[PDB]
Amino acid sequence: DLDKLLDLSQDELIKLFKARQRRKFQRGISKKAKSLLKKIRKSKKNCEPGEKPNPVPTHLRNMTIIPEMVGSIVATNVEIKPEMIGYYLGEFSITY
Amino acid sequence: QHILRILNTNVDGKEKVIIALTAIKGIGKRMATVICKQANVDPTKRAGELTTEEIDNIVHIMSTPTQFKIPDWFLNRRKDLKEGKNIHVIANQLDSYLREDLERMKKIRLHRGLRHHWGLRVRGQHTK
Amino acid sequence: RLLEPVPFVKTNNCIKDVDADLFIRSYATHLKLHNKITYPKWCTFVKTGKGRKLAPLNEDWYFIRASSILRRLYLHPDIGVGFLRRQFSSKQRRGVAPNHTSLASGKILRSILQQLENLGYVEQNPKKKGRRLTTKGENAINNFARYINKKVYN
Amino acid sequence: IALTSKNLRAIEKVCSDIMKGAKEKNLNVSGPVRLPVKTLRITTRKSPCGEGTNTWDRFELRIYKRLIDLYSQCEVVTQMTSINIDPVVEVEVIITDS
Amino acid sequence: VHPKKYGQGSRQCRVCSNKHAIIRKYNINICRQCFRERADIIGFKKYR
Amino acid sequence: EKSKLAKVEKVLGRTGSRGGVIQVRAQFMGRFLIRNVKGPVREGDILALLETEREARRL
Amino acid sequence: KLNHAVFIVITPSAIAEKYKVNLSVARAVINHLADSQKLYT
Amino acid sequence: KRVQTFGKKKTAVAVATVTNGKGLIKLNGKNLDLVEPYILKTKVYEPLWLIGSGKLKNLDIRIRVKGGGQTSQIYAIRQAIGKGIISYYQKYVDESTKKELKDVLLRYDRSLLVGDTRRCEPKKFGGKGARARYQKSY
Amino acid sequence: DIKLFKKWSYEEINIADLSLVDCIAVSQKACVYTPHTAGRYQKKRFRKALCPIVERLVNSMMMHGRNNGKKLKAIRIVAYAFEIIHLMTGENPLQVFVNAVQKGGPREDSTRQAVDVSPLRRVNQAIYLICTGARNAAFRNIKSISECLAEEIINCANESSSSYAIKKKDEIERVAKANR
RNA sequence: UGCAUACUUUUCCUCCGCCGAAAGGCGUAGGUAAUCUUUAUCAAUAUAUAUCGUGAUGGGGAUAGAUUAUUGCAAUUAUUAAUCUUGAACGAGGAAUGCCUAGUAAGCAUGAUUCAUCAGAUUGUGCUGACUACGUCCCUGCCCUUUGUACACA
RNA sequence: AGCGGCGAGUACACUGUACUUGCU
C-alpha cells in the first residue's frame, strides 16, 4: 500500500503527485526544508515506535510532506496521513 | 413514441435527442455530446424515436469509455489520487463518489474541510 | 435573392471578385466530394476554441474552415498561426466576470496548415515568412473561382 | 541628419538654418521631412491625502523629430550645426550618395 | 537580509524613499506625491 | 371623434406648471380663437381643435 | 408550456399559428410544401 | 488621364482615383457589391443614379479603405466618389454637364459632397460615461 | 424616379390632416432607398419634423432594455414587417403607415385642464405608442417582431381595437375630454 | 548537485515553425521603435446562414469536487489558469434614490495604471448613433431685493 | 507613408484587372 510510495524515487513521487508539488519539487526544496527533514528523521529514529513523535520547533507553514515524513505533528494535532500529503500543513490561528 | 422512462427521467419526447441525453445526465453537454458521437446518432433527429438498441449502445459507451478515444483529460475526475484510476460516472450512483470524496475530506479535516463543514465557501462569501 | 443587380463592370479574374460566404460552402462541398483531406478523427472530440465552450454542431466544420483559411491566404499572402487564431478568436463568458475576447485553439489550425502543405496548395519560404499560395494552386483557384462565378452567373 | 527636441521653435530655427546653408553651398538636399508628432502622457491624482473628491490631471509632452539628407562633408556639416545649435536640440547625422 | 529583484522591495521612490504609490510609466521610478510638484520642472506640462 | 383645422398665426407665450403649455391663436373659420397646445409649434402650423367656442385663459 | 407537435401565406409565424405548431416544425413543413428569416418568395 | 481625390467621413478615410477606362470601379481588391450590407449598397448606388451609368461607362474609379466602422467607410467612400466624379468632370469629360451634375447633387443632399464634423469627444472625468459621473449615495 | 427599396416612388399620397403631411415631409429631398439616414437631427426645431416618417419609425423600435444601439437589425425588422404588410394586405404599406400616423396620434391631452397637441409632437408620440405597443407584443409572446409591427401598424391604420396605439390615444382623449 | 572563478547576454513586446485541445513549452526574424509585435489592421456590439422556437428551458451561472501549466524560493487562505463534473436565485424588481440633451444616453468592447502573478477598480480610445424637449420655477439647491428678528459658535 | 510610371509575369478579357520583383 504505502510501501511502494516509501521505496519509489522522486520522479515517480512527483508523477504520482499533482502538478503543484511537481513544480515545487522541480524548482527546489531549500536547505531549511532539508535540515527539517534530517532533524525529523533523527527524531523519528530515536523516538520509541509505540508513541507519537513530538512536533517541530521554529514553526513555519510552507513545507510539503512525504510519506517518509510520517509520524509528524505540529506545535493543531492532526497526524499526517498519506491522503493529506499534497497540501502542506497550514494549521494556524483560525480560532472561532 | 414519446415519453420514455429510464433510470433517470427522460420524458423528453418532443425536445431534441441531444438535449435529451444531456438532460438525463452530463448536463455540461460534453459527456452527452461525445456519447452521442460514439453511439452515432444524428442530431437532426429528435428524442421521440430513440430505440432500446441505441440505449444499449449508450450504456456500452458509458461503461468505461477508457478503451474509447475519450482521453484522460476529458475523463471527469481524472486522478483522484489513490492506487487506481476513476472515470466519469453518470448520475445517481455518480453522486455516491462525491459523497465519499466529501467523507474523505471530512476525515482529512483540514482548513477547507472545516470551512465546508461549518457552512462556508472555499474562497469565502466575503461578508466583510 | 442572393444575387443583386450590379451597376458597374466586374472582373471575375480570381477569387477576390467572388463572395466569400458561398465560396467557403461550395469549396467545402468540393473538398468532401474529392476527399482531398482527412476529417481527421482526432479533432472532432474538442471544441474549436476555449471561449466557444461548445461543439461546432455541424460535422463539416473542418472542411468549412479549410476553405476560409485558403481565402485568407489569398486575401493577404502572409499567413502565420497567430493571425489565424486572432481572426477566428471569439468572445468568452467567464461566468460572473465580464465577457472577454480569447483566441481559438491553434492546434486545429496547425493541422489544417500541415494538411494544406501536404496537398501542395501552400508553400513555406524564409522570405515572405507567412504562408503563401504556390503558382499551381493560384491558377487552379483562379479557374475554380471562375467556374463558380459562371455557375452562379448563368 | 535628424533632429529631436521638445520645443518647436528650436527645431524651426534649426531647420531654417540648414535649408539656407544648403542653398548657400548649392548641394543636393532632400525636402524638409515633417514627421508625425509623438506625444507622451501620464495621468495622476491630486490630493495627496485620501480625503475629498477624487481629482486627476494629465500631462502632455509632444516630441518634435524631423529628417533631412545632404551630400556634403561630414566635418563641415557638424561644424556648422555645432555653430548654430543649442543644447536643448539633439541631432544625429546620416549621409547620402545620390 | 533577503533582497529580491522583483516587486516593491526591488525598488522604491527616489526622493521620498517610500514603498507606496510608485509609478513605473516610462521608468519615472518616482512617487506621485513629489512627482506632482516636480512634474513642471521635469517637463510634464498639463494641457488637459 | 372629430378634429378641426387651426392656423397658428403667432405664438403668444410658454406657460403652465412646468412651462409645458403654449398659448396660440387658432383658426377654423372662428378667426379669433385661443388655444393651449403641447409640443413644439413653429410659425405656420396647422392644429386640431376639439370644441368650437371653448376658450382658454390668457395670462 | 409547449403543447404543439408535428403530427397532423407560407411565412413561418402564419403557418405556426394556422397549424398550432412550433416554429421549427413549421419550417420543416414549409420545406416539405415548397419542395434565419429571409425575403418572402 | 488620372485625377485623385480624398475622403474623410466619420473616423474612416478613403482615397479615390478617376481614370479613363470601361467602368471598372473597384473597392480595394473586391467589388462594391461584395460589401455584404445591401443597405449600404443602396447608399453607394445613390450617387450613381444621380450622375449616370452611361457617363460612368468610360471611367474607372479605384477606391481604397483603411480604418473606421462600417457606416464610417460607407459614408467616406460615398463622399470620396462624389468628389472624384466632380473633379474629373471639371477636368476631363465636360464642363457643361458638370454644373447640372453638381446642381442635382446639392438639390438631392449636401452630405454627398462634404461629410459631417461629428466625432467622439474626449472622455470626461467623473465616471464611466462621458457626460455622466458615478452614482452617489447620501 | 427614386424608389423606396427600388420599389416605391410613392407617386400618390393622401391629403391626410393637412398638417401631418408637412410634418412627415416625405419628398424627393427625403426620398431614400433604405433607412438609416445619419444626417444631423438636433439642429433646429423644424429639423425634428424634417426627418422622414419612415426614418422616425426605424429609429425608435430599438429601445427595449438591452438592445440599445442595434439599428441595422431594427432596419431589417421593419423591412420584413413592411413585406409582411404587403403580403397580408395588397395595398401599399407606405400608405398604410401614413394612415397609421394620421389616425394614431393623440390630439388633445391634459397636464394640470386640457391642451392641444402640436402636429410634430403628435407624430412623434404616435410613433412612440407604436413603439411601446410593438415592444409589448414582442415581450415574450412567441410571435416575431416583424409580425408584431405588421399587426400593430395595420390595426392602427384601420383603427382596430387590437391596436395599443389607438387604445392609448382613445384613453388619453377620454381623460382630456373628462378634464376639459 | 553546491561554493569560487572567466566568457555572450537571458533579464520587453514578440512574429514564426514546431510539442501540448488548451493552459503552457522549445529555437530563432524584428524592433530602444510611423521600421518588429502591428496597424493594407489587434476587440466587440453586428453581420449572412443553420439549431433551438420563450417550456426556470438548452436560458442563467451562485455552488463544490477532480486536474493539468505557468507566475512567484515560497499560491495552504485550492493566486491565476485550459478541461470535465456540479445547476442557487432570477418572469425585470416596495418605499425611496441616482444620471442625462447629440457622436452625448445606453450597449458593446478595448488601451493604460499599480503588476513577478492577479481588474469585477480607476483613467483614456473606438464601434453601434436613440425617444423627447429647445422650456419652467413645482420640488430641491443656490443667488438678488425687500422685510422681521430677543440669532452672531449665527 | 503615399500617388504614380515601367522591368518580368501568375489567369481572364481584348482592337486592364486580383496577386508577385526593382528603381525613379
Q: Give CA separation, A80 vs A66, B110, H8, I117, in Å.
A: 9, 11, 73, 84
Residue nearest J128 (alpha carbon to C1'): I69
For cell 526591488, the residue is E10
* Residue list, annotated binding site of E for Zn(2+): 13, 16, 31, 34
Task: Report phi then psi at H63, rounded to 5.
Answer: -140, 135
What number of other Cβ atoms are within 10 A of residue B50's Cβ?
22
Beta strands in chain C (DSSP E): 90-92, 100-102, 122-123, 132-133
> Do B94 and B127 reside in the same domain of the chain?
yes
Any idea what the Cα angle at residue C128 is, between residues C124 and C133, rounded to 5°? 50
- CA pair distance F24, E11, nearest whole angstrom: 75
Closest chain A residue to B113, measured at CA: A84
Candidates G13, G17, G40, partner chain I, best to mutate (most I CBs within 10 A): G13
- CA pair distance H35, I171, nearest whole angstrom: 48
Of I34, I39, I40, the CB nearest to H39: I34
Instruction: Name the structure determination technique.
Output: cryo-EM
The β-bridge partners of F36 are: F23
Question: B25 and B31 in contact (C-beta within 8 Å)?
Answer: yes
For cell 477508457, the residue is B66
Of G9, G14, G37, the CB nearest to I80: G37
Q: Give CA separation, A73 vs A52, A90, I178, in Å.
A: 8, 12, 88
- CA pair distance D53, D46, nearest whole angstrom: 10
Furthest C-alpha separation in chain E: 45
For cell 466575503, the residue is B126
CB contact under 8 A, H42 and I75: no
Domains annotated on chain A, with CATH: 1-92 (3.30.860.10)
Which amino acid makes up residue B31? Answer: M
- CA pair distance D89, D82, nearest whole angstrom: 11
Q: Looking at the domain that runs over E1-48, which CATH code has it been given?
A: 4.10.830.10
Candidates A6, A37, A10, A38; CA nearest to A26 is A10
I25-29 contact pairs (CB < 8 A, 24+) = I25/I49, I25/I50, I25/I51, I25/I52, I25/I53, I26/I52, I26/I53, I26/I54, I26/I98, I28/H108, I28/I2, I29/H107, I29/H108, I29/H109
> Do B59 and B2 reside in the same domain of the chain?
yes
Per-domain residue ranges of chain E? 1-48
Q: Any idea which nucleotide's C1' is nearest the CA of C16?
A: K18
Residue nearest J79 (alpha carbon to C1'): B123
Q: Give CA separation, A18 vs A22, A26, A86, A87, B110, in Å.
A: 6, 12, 8, 10, 18
Cell of C76: 493577404
Cell of B24: 438525463
CB contact under 8 A, F40 and I48: yes
Per-domain residue ranges of chain C? 1-154
Question: C106-119 and C61-75 are packed helices; what angle lies between their axes, rounded to 10 degrees?
Answer: 70
Domains annotated on chain D, with CATH: 1-98 (3.30.70.600)
Residues of chain A neighbouring B110 (CB-CB closer than 8 A):
78, 84, 87, 90
How many CA atoms, within 13 angstroms, populate the side-chain half-sphere of residue B75? 19
Per-domain residue ranges of chain G? 1-41
- CA pair distance H80, H59, nearest whole angstrom: 15
Cell of D9: 521653435
Any idea what the Cα angle at residue I54 is, between residues I51 and I57, rounded to 5°? 95
> Do B53 and B83 reside in the same domain of the chain?
no
- CA pair distance A87, B9, nearest whole angstrom: 40
CB < 7 A to strand K: residues 48-77, chain C: 74, 76-77
CB contact under 8 A, D59 and E32: no
DSSP class per residue in G16-40: HHHHT--HHHHHHHHHHHH------
The radius of gyration of chain I's CA atoms, rounded to the nearest angstrom, is: 16
CATH of residue B33: 1.10.8.50
Strand J: which positions are within 7 A of a protein CB? 14-23, 34, 37-38, 40-55, 57-58, 60-78, 81-87, 92, 97-110, 112-117, 119-120, 122-138
Residue nearest J70 (alpha carbon to C1'): A23
Query: C-alpha dihedral over G9, G15, G17, G20, to 10 degrees?
Result: 150
Distance B84 CA to J80 C1' (A): 30
Structural domain that includes position I130: 1-180
Residues of chain G neighbouring I83 (CB-CB closer than 8 A):
39-40
Cell of C14: 480570381
Contacts (Cβ under 8 Å, ≥6 apart) of C26: C148
What's H122's DSSP letter? P
Q: Is the CB of C14 under 7 A from strand K?
A: yes
- CA pair distance A15, A4, nearest whole angstrom: 13
Cell of D26: 548649392
B53 to chain A, any CB pair closer than 8 A? The answer is no
Candidates D29, D95, D33; CA nearest to D64 is D33
Q: Is the CB of H32 under 7 A from strand K?
A: no
At how many Å resolution was this determined? 2.4
How many CA atoms, within 13 angstroms, populate the side-chain half-sphere of residue C4? 20
Domains annotated on chain F, with CATH: 1-59 (2.40.50.140)
Question: C136 and C122 in contact (C-beta within 8 Å)?
Answer: no
Question: Which subunits sit against I, judged by 3+ Cβ pairs under 8 A?
Answer: F, G, H
Question: H36 and C4 in contact (C-beta within 8 Å)?
Answer: no
Candidates C26, C33, C35, C31; CA nearest to C2 is C26
Quote the distance between the C-alpha of residue C134 and its chain's center: 16
Candidates D24, D36, D38; CA nearest to D70 is D24
- CA pair distance I53, I63, nearest whole angstrom: 17
- CA pair distance I127, I142, nearest whole angstrom: 23
Question: Which subunits sit against A, judged by 3+ Cβ pairs under 8 A?
Answer: B
Q: Is the CB of C143 under 7 A from strand K?
A: yes
Distance D5 CA to J35 C1' (A): 21
H or E, element range at C6? none
Cell of I49: 419634423
Q: Any idea which nucleotide's C1' is nearest the CA of D56?
A: J123
Distance C112 CA to J82 C1' (A): 22
CATH 2.60.40.3140 fits C1-154, yes or no: no
I169 to chain F, any CB pair closer than 8 A? The answer is no
The β-bridge partners of D58 are: D43
CB contact under 8 A, D48 and E28: no
Residues in chain H: 138
CB contact under 8 A, C54 and B29: yes
Candidates F59, I84, H93, B27; CA nearest to G10 is I84
CB contact under 8 A, H33 and C17: no
For cell 510539503, the residue is A64
CB contact under 8 A, B110 and A90: yes
Candidates A79, A80, A74; CA nearest to A93 is A74
The structural domain count of chain I equals 1
First to last CA, chain F: 30
Distance D18 CA to J81 C1' (A): 58
Cis peptide before C40 (omega within 30 of 0): yes
Residues of chain H neighbouring I27 (CB-CB closer than 8 A):
none
Cell of B106: 471530512
Distance C28 CA to J11 C1' (A): 48
> Do B67 and B78 reside in the same domain of the chain?
no
